[PDB]
Each structure stands twice: as C-alpha cells, then as structure tokens.
Design a protein around this ligand. Structure first.
Ligand SMILES: Nc1ccn([C@H]2CC[C@@H](COP(=O)(O)OP(=O)(O)OP(=O)(O)O)O2)c(=O)n1
Ligand SMILES: [Mg+2]
Ligand SMILES: [Mg+2]
Ligand SMILES: [Mg+2]
Length: 431
DNA sequence: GCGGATCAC
DNA sequence: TATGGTGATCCGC
C-alpha cells in the first residue's frame, strides 16, 4: 500500500467513531491556537523584529562560543524490538508481516508490516484492514525485559552510567571508554563468532563492536547514532536503521551540514502539534528555524525559543544525568463502559490498592493524589488534591481519590459518569 | 498548587 | 466489537 491509499482506508475505518469526533475537536483547538498565533504575527512591527533579532543573536553568540564538541555520544536502538523477539522465537513468522499487541492496540510492527502503513499505537482492527494477512501475536513483555537485560549488560561495558530510555533504547557517553581504548591491545577487543574478529580503536569501531556483541548474544540487530551531543546522536540514530550506524564527525561544519535540511519534526521534543504550528510560519527544516529566530522569540515563550535555538544551532545535552528520583507514580486502565457509581468506586479503590503496592516496592509516600477520568467520548479530566502529610496505604490514597471522584459524580448529577478509563496518580514525594 | 496540553517511549 | 499505559514538562492561571 501507498501513503495515499493508507490515509484513505484509515479515514474509512475511523469515520463516525467517538474517537474521531474527539480528534476533530482537538484539531479545531490546534487550528484556533494557530489562528491566534497568526493574529500575533500580524501585529508584530519591524522595529520589534529588529530589536528581537539583536537580542537573539546576542544569546546565540553566547551559545555558539560554548559549543562542546569533545564528547562522543551514542544512541542505541534495537530494530523493531518486540516484533524481532517474536520473530526470533517463531520461525513460522519468517518473511511475514507481523505486529505485537491486541486487536484494540498494537505495540509495534516489523518492517514488513510497516510497509502497509501499520505502526505502533494503531488499533489492531484498523491495521488488519491495512493488511489482512497481518499476524498479530500477543505481547510477552517479560521476554522483552529479559533480552533487554542482556543488551544492558553489554552497554554497561562502555558506559556504566548509560541512560536507558526504554527497553530497547539507550544513550551512551563513550568518551571515557574511547580514551582508555586508544591504547588497548588486540586482546581486549577481540570477540568470537557464534573463529574470531577484532574491532578497531575509533568511535565507529566501538559501536560496530557493540552492535556485533548484541547480535551475537541475542540474535537481534541494533541501529546506532554517533555525535557530539544527545540531540544529534538521537537524530542520526535513525539515519541507517535498521542494523545500521551513522556518525556526525565532531567538527562544527559537519554538525551544521547535517542540520541544514533536517526536518525539525525529527528532533526529540517537536511533536505533531509543534510541527503544525511551526509549519504555519513556514518553518520545516532547522535552517528555517534559525532564520525565523527573532519572530519565534516573539511568538513563543523563553524556554521554547531557547530550545528552538539550541536545535537550529545543532546543540544539545553533552552529558547524561544519572537518573534522578521519580516525580510521580501512577496506574490507570481502560475498560468497557462503566456508568454505575458503585462500580466506579470499586475501580477507584482497586487502582488505589495497586498503586499502594507499587509504592510499597519502592517504599515511597507522596502528598498529592490525582485521579484521571476519560469518558466514552475520550474527553479526559484530571482532579488532584494535595495533603499536609504524606500518604502511602491503599486506604489513605482511596480516602482522597474517593472524594475527588465523588465531586466529579456530583457535578453531573442526575447523570451518570459514562467513563471508559480511570486512573490514580501519586506525586509530591519528599525532598 | 491545579488542570489542560504536549511529548517520548 | 474494538483507539493504550507511564512518566515528564510547560503554561496560564
Ligand atoms: N506510541 C508508542 C510508540 C512506541 N511505544 C513503545 C513500544 C515499543 C517501543 C519502541 O517502538 P518504536 O520506537 O515505535 O518502534 P520499534 O519497534 O522500536 O522499531 P524502529 O525503532 O526500528 O522503528 O516504544 C509505545 O509504548 N507507545
Ligand atoms: Mg525505539
Ligand atoms: Mg526501536
Ligand atoms: Mg520529534
């Protein structure tokens, strides 16, 4: 299938559903938000643009002088991870389009299926219309976690403080390892094929060694990206996927050359909405992002245009922060419609118990309890309460959540809450 | 501190 | 029949 036909089949499958109504509502909000921004771009004067330009150029030179190109950052990504595990262990799924998940929701797909437009976060019953020969195999998350343990053990040899972003995705700072490796005998960097092979001393070679060891240990392929900061490493991690590598050499000109026509949507932090809004200003590549910096410093908040400027200049984090403490812990769940209040109170109490057990495993207590309600029209509400003393048990948590829920049930009385999802979150952990 | 929005994976 | 779960951040109040 092709990008034109797929959008069509999808449109046919989603049309008229409550889900799609909510999407239309959300798109209208995005549209209006854009219209407003445009009303702002209309009332901007050349004088203000000139002044803003000098402000941004000042701060820009401030960035550019501090550009750090001495670190070597790697982003490792297992290719089609979940589906690749499932393919590794069931030969019958060879050369076939598969996805991992349920008929309600798919977690991931293999490249074969991706060619039919089926992808992560897409309901199975739609992907089936995109590809009726698609094989949906159920998730085996424990397996994935285990394989993930195998590759984490390997990544720890190159940066013990590597930063895992998910089960199949991680950031490495291999600077120090490169330094030690430059005077390593051939013995420390020789490995056997599952009768031996040796890897060189360069960054590309270090990553070829990593990918090699991973493929030996798990029978699965990884792609990687190499660059002076996390932002760039993450972007060029995608460049030669699957089973590929790419490096951006640590010179300013290489960074700039790579950035030049890079769609800003590839950058981590630019989602669909920001992409649409920036597109409204004619900004699609990172150089257009640079050229519009003053206008952006007038249309957007400080944090946002500072961030955009970092993107446009090819800057990004050059050190991995050792994982700080979690700021929240939550549990939520979708179900067939629940509208009777007593049942809703039951689900709330259940979620609270589950949450309390999870808090128990990390021995945490917090001061804020938030509930999440999604009605049958996919409208999401959130209701929090912060309390003087920390709470931890299922009874305490349910004590707060119960009242929040009660308030919401009352606000619509005499109508029942028709909800398809409920959740409970706890935060405000102690300093 | 609260709630909606946005984003990553 | 049927459209997820967890965690984080930001902005405007
Ligand atoms: N909306 C999404 C998208 C992804 N994931 C999870 C499921 C698998 C993991 C990685 O999936 P992707 O990065 O979407 O794809 P992949 O299978 O890793 O394949 P590739 O990265 O090679 O495209 O992230 C998720 O929970 N929710
Ligand atoms: Mg990934
Ligand atoms: Mg991946
Ligand atoms: Mg992005």
């Amino acid at each position: 299938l092709d990008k034109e036909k797929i959008n069509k089949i999808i449109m046919e499958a989603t049309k008229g559903s409550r889900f799609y109504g909510n999407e239309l509502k959300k798109e209208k909000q995005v549209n209006q938000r854009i219209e407003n921004m445009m009303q702002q771009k209309a009332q901007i004067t050349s004088q203000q643009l000139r002044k803003a330009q000098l402000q941004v150029d000042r701060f820009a030179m401030e960035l550019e002088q501090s550009r750090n190109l001495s670190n070597t950052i790697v982003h490792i990504d297992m290719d089609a991870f979940y589906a690749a595990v499932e393919m590794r262990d069931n030969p019958e799924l060879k050369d076939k389009p598969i996805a991992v998940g349920s008929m309600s929701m798919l977690s991931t797909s293999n490249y074969h299926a991706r060619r039919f437009g089926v992808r992560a976060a897409m309901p199975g019953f739609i992907a089936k219309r995109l590809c009726p020969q698609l094989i949906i195999v159920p998730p085996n998350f424990d397996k994935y976690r285990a394989v993930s343990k195998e590759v984490k053990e390997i990544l720890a040899d190159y940066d013990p403080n590597f930063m895992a972003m998910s089960l199949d995705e991680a950031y490495l700072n291999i600077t120090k390892h490169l330094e030690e490796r430059q005077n390593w005998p051939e013995d420390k960097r020789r490995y056997f094929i599952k009768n031996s092979v040796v890897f060189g001393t360069s960054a590309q070679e270090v990553v070829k060694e990593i990918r090699f060891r991973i493929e030996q240990k798990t029978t699965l392929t990884a792609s990687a990206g190499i660059a002076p900061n996390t932002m760039l490493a993450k972007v060029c991690s995608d460049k030669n996927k699957p089973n590929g590598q790419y490096q951006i050499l640590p010179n300013r000109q290489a960074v700039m050359d790579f950035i030049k026509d890079l769609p800003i949507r590839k950058v981590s932090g630019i989602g669909k909405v920001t992409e649409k809004m920036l597109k409204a200003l004619g900004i699609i590549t990172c150089t257009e992002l640079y050229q519009q910096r003053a206008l952006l410093s007038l249309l957007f908040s400080e944090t946002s245009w500072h961030y955009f400027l970092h993107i446009s200049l090819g800057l990004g984090s050059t050190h991995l922060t050792r994982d700080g403490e979690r700021k929240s812990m939550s549990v939520e769940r979708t179900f067939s419609e629940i509208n009777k209040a007593e049942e809703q109170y039951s689900l709330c109490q259940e979620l609270c118990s589950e949450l309390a057990q999870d808090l128990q495993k990390e021995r945490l207590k917090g001061r804020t309890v938030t509930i999440k309600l999604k009605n049958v029209n996919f409208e999401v509400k959130t209701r929090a309460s912060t309390v003087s003393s920390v709470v931890s048990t299922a009874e305490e948590i349910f004590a707060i959540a119960k009242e929040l829920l009660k308030t919401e049930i009352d606000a619509d009385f005499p109508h029942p809450l028709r909800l398809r999802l409920m959740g409970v979150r706890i935060s405000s952990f102690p300093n």
